[PDB]
Design a protein around this ligand. Structure first.
Ligand code: FMN
Ligand code: SF4
Ligand code: SF4
Ligand code: SF4
Ligand code: FES
Ligand code: FES
Ligand code: K
Lengths: 431, 44, 213, 263
């Protein structure tokens, strides 16, 4: 067992064209190991592929972190007449998250091969890659790559000479963050408003077009071929137990070199920021708070960031979450209340409006936060806002409602003196 | 030789309005025949 | 900003719209991507194709999409008003979209927005009198490590300063088309001042491949 | 044989597979509060008024949509269930207009009654309220859309019962609006039934507007003669005058609908 994690070697990185300095097209992809022995992987069978993903300990990289091997095994059942589909979530809408964008445009063939291998394990006839409409150039890059795979016989009829037919369609979104939610993504593909479905049924039983479906994040799908080639045991050698593998991180905000970088799971938060992002603007002592996994995760203050690790279990114990592993850094010159208030404004603009607690509650929370920014409120409203957030959390159809409540809870948990100070200043200036 | 100092993703600077859908038209001849629900639509 | 339609002389059911013969060929490819019996799945791509041909979506374009795909017009109206990339009113030739969500705000997207307004002489949500530019704020565009950034039509312009965006607008006025991507010195999402990873040449086919395959 | 055993507050009940939690409760005489759910429409699950605790489960379930599992104990009166109802009611009323005195639904309003029975007794909403513009959908149904609670019952009735896909939702989030988008009249021979199924005073009878209050009406159960179907009706009268006609449920004839001529 390892005590410490990080310092991932280049030989062990999966996304080796992360920065687009090598040819992203098929020839460059093959020279880097993509599409190698895909036929042999396919001829191993869905159970062997699903075993490798289970052994790798891989968990969903879209934000929720479900164990990928178990989730994909819901599809490993006899057909009943309906087709079966893999839906790749390339909506990438969480603020702070831009990792999936670099996979699609610089390593498109990893994603295409992942669809074939991942789709084979589920017995899917095709993959629908849902990419946010704003990613037009990335969508075109992916479409060029898919045409190359088709022309080379790597997908389509008799993919990789394996006797398995598989198509890969790209469908673009039209501007909605809620379409990253797995059931709302399915609804969007079907030509409706992106409004999430209740569960049950679950997608593996009733999904896109009403057929058995699996929705998977781009990063989850793109690492599957490598896991099969190099083995699950290789992947599980990275990170803590139940926190396996490498991870793409986005470090943005008040850092010297905001960047995307691949790094081992369970790396300390401080080492990640200082080693790869060039440190906090103005020095580590200038740090105020970090949102560790995209806007939906509660912020943690500087004291927590001193020692916390970046994996699913460590961040849960710190009262937050890994999320998409989008690290947003705020230095001490930040107006923390405004920064969080802007995130609630984001959720207010993205709420699909379907269900009452988020249609009405998020808009309500948005109004209170705007007053809290100016201090035009009473301290008794802080506890009220906490209770409103708890009335949204766990009572909505989808997790966007949970995602709007958690950032508010993070602000109140760690920066209540700041909120009260703003109110006290306003009362004097307006006495 | 080997180089690591240049950006090799410049093709998209020449993409245009219909690039994505033109590629989708090209891909149409490689697809497998679609399945059918057995009716023209849910309203039939 | 409203979500009800009032017929005007320039936007009514009799406003001319029809897909060009080439666009009808592209529609067949779109519709063929989906199982038979589920043509409605083509509403989003086809509705966006109408905007690409026309620039925006008059009520007559929305009606034409409903007719082609044999879906009730209301279901096209619901999609047109739900997704924010659809323009139900005309937009300037260059739709400037500035991200102002917290990660871009933390890196001074306000300066970018203020620089644009000062140069173009317009406020957010407005179109220039020449009808060349329209300006709006948008939520996260998925390029947060490259903040602050804007999207003009289909392209991203990244790591902007007030000087960079003003140069981009000057090129657009001149009829040139600026190259997308970071304007700071780097090429994409790599850390500035030197790669901290992927410095070594990547391994070739078969590296680390487990035994048994 | 086929039936499975579930429990409603510890009381065993045998139900068929596929029975929802809400239907299991109604087997023992407990009516779960609802707004979006209507047993003759397709399930929606959007209002969230039906949330109920399942014993030993940390998350409340939407009773109207959740299929009941064998051995579940549905706690319809637990503290968790009551707080869920109070919270949802609080969100429903936050933007609702202070219209009861001028609103024809007053006195027979499911929002009023479930607020009394399941909601808190006061407000902590300190902001301004939403206001929505009204739609004109013909001479029979008056729309005061600021009262709408986005339950989508009208949309589902129009699509499924009347077979008319003219009603929908436009916009997003708090600004989501029920209507036709374009100026358009909802003239169908069953159009008036959306007045009945709208839980609030958002859709009201135009001919009936302002003329009576529910508590003062006398109800005479009777039969329709506008056609030969024989729809069962209720004639509301006050002080010797006929005031309106309402459907009277009859499963084997009109169910709970009537035609606009009958109405
Ligand atoms: C509001 C909202 C937005 C989401 N956006 C994304 C997204 O952009 N990309 C993504 O992979 N998952 C997103 N998710 C999570 C998905 O619903 C789902 O958990 C994920 O796609 C499953 O893939 P995975 O198991 O491989 O992680 C979002 C969820 C919510 C509630
Ligand atoms: S929580 Fe918000 S986004 Fe999710 S279904 Fe409910 S209203 Fe829509
Ligand atoms: S719908 Fe009910 S709660 Fe709303 S104003 Fe009318 S009577 Fe009052
Ligand atoms: S108008 Fe009435 S029935 Fe229709 S969505 Fe609003 S509250 Fe529900
Ligand atoms: S916050 Fe601006 S691109 Fe993400
Ligand atoms: S009655 Fe169940 S969510 Fe509305
Ligand atoms: K009513």
């Amino acid at each position: 067992k390892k005590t410490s994690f990080g310092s991932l070697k280049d030989e062990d990185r999966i996304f080796t064209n992360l920065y687009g300095r090598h040819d992203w097209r098929l020839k460059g992809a093959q020279s880097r190991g993509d599409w190698y022995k895909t036929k042999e992987i396919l001829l191993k069978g869905p159970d062997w592929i699903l075993g490798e993903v289970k052994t790798s300990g891989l968990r969903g990289r879209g934000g929720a972190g479900f164990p990928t091997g178990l989730k994909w095994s819901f599809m490993n059942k006899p057909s009943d007449g309906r087709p079966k589909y893999l839906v790749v979530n390339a909506d990438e809408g969480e603020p702070g998250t831009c990792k999936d964008r670099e996979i699609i445009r610089h390593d498109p063939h990893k994603l295409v091969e992942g669809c074939l291998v991942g789709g084979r394990a589920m017995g899917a006839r095709a993959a629908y890659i849902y990419i946010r409409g704003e990613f037009y150039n990335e969508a075109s890059n992916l479409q060029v790559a898919i045409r190359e795979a088709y022309e080379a016989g790597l997908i389509g009829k008799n993919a990789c000479g394996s006797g398995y037919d598989f198509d890969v369609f790209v469908v673009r979104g039209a501007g909605a963050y809620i379409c990253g939610e797995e059931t709302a993504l399915i609804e969007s593909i079907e030509g409706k408003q992106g409004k999430p479905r209740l569960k049950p049924p679950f997608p593996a039983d009733v999904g896109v077009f009403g057929c058995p479906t699996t929705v998977a994040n781009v990063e989850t799908v793109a690492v599957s071929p490598t896991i099969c080639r190099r083995g699950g045991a290789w992947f599980a050698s990275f990170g803590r137990e139940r926190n396996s593998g490498t991870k793409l991180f986005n470090i943005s905000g008040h850092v010297n070199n905001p960047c995307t970088v691949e790094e081992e799971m369970s790396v300390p938060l401080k080492e990640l920021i200082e080693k790869h992002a060039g440190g906090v603007t103005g020095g580590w002592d200038n740090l105020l708070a970090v949102i560790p996994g995209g806007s939906s995760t509660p912020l943690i203050p500087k004291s927590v960031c001193e020692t916390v690790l970046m994996d699913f279990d460590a961040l849960i114990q710190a009262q937050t979450g890994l999320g998409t592993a989008a690290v947003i850094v705020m230095d001490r010159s930040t107006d923390i209340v405004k920064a969080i208030a802007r995130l609630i404004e984001f959720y207010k603009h993205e709420s699909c409006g379907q269900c009452t607690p988020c249609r009405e509650g998020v808009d309500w929370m948005n109004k209170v936060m705007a007053r809290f920014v100016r201090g035009d409120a009473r301290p008794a409203e802080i506890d009220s806002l906490w209770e409103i957030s708890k009335q949204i959390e766990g009572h909505t159809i989808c997790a966007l409602g949970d995602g709007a409540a958690w950032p508010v809870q993070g602000l109140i948990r760690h920066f209540r003196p700041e909120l009260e100070e703003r109110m006290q200043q306003f009362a004097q200036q307006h006495q | 030789p080997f180089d690591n100092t240049t950006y090799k993703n410049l093709q998209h600077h020449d993409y245009s309005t219909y690039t994505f859908l033109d590629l989708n038209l090209d891909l149409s001849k490689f697809r497998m025949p679609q399945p059918s629900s057995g009716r023209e639509s849910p309203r039939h | 900003a409203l979500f009800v339609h009032r017929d005007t002389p320039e936007n009514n059911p009799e406003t001319p719209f029809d897909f060009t013969p080439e666009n009808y060929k592209r529609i067949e490819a779109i519709v063929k991507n989906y199982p038979e019996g589920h043509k409605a799945a083509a509403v989003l791509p086809v509705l966006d194709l109408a905007q690409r041909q026309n620039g925006w979506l008059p009520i007559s374009a929305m009606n034409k999409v409903a007719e082609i795909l044999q879906v009730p017009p209301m279901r096209v109206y619901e999609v047109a008003t739900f997704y924010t990339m659809y323009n139900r009113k005309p937009v300037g030739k260059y739709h400037i979209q500035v991200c102002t969500t917290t990660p871009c705000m933390l890196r001074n997207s306000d300066s970018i927005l203020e620089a644009i307004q000062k140069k173009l002489g317009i406020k957010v949500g407005e179109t220039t009198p020449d009808k060349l530019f329209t300006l709006i704020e948008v939520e996260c565009l998925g390029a947060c490590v490259n903040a602050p950034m804007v999207q003009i039509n289909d392209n991203y312009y990244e790591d902007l300063t007030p000087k960079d965006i003003e140069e981009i607008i000057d090129e657009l006025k001149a009829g040139k088309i600026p190259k997308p991507g970071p304007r700071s010195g780097r090429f994409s999402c790599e850390p500035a001042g030197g790669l901290t990873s992927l410095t070594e040449p990547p391994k070739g086919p078969g590296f680390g491949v487990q035994a048994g395959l | 044989s086929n039936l499975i055993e579930v429990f409603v507050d510890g009381q065993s009940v045998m139900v068929e597979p596929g029975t929802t939690v809400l239907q299991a409760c109604e087997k023992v005489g407990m009516q779960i509060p609802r707004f979006c759910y209507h047993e003759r429409l397709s399930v929606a699950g959007n209002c969230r008024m039906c949330l109920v605790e399942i014993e030993k489960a940390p998350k409340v379930v939407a009773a109207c949509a959740m299929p009941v599992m064998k051995g579940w104990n549905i706690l319809t009166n637990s503290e968790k269930t009551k707080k869920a109802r109070e919270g949802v009611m609080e969100f429903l009323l936050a933007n609702h207009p202070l219209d009861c005195p001028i609103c024809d639904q007053g006195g027979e309003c499911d929002l009023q009654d479930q607020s009394m029975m399941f909601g808190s007794d006061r407000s902590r909403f300190l902001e301004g309220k939403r206001a929505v513009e009204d739609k004109n959908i013909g001479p029979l149904v008056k729309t005061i859309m600021t009262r709408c609670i986005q339950c989508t019952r009208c949309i589902r009735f129009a699509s499924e019962i009347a077979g008319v896909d003219d009603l929908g939702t436009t916009g997003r989030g708090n600004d989501m609006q029920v209507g036709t988008y374009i100026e358009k009249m909802f003239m169908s021979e069953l159009s008036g039934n959306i007045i009945d199924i709208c839980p609030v005073g958002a859709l009201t009878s135009k001919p009936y507007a302002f003329t009576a209050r529910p508590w003062e009406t006398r109800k005479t159960e009777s039969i329709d003669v506008m056609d030969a179907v024989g729809s069962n009706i209720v004639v509301s009268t006050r002080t010797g005058e006929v005031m309106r006609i309402l459907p009277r449920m009859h499963e084997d004839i009109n169910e709970e609908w009537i035609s606009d001529k009958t109405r």
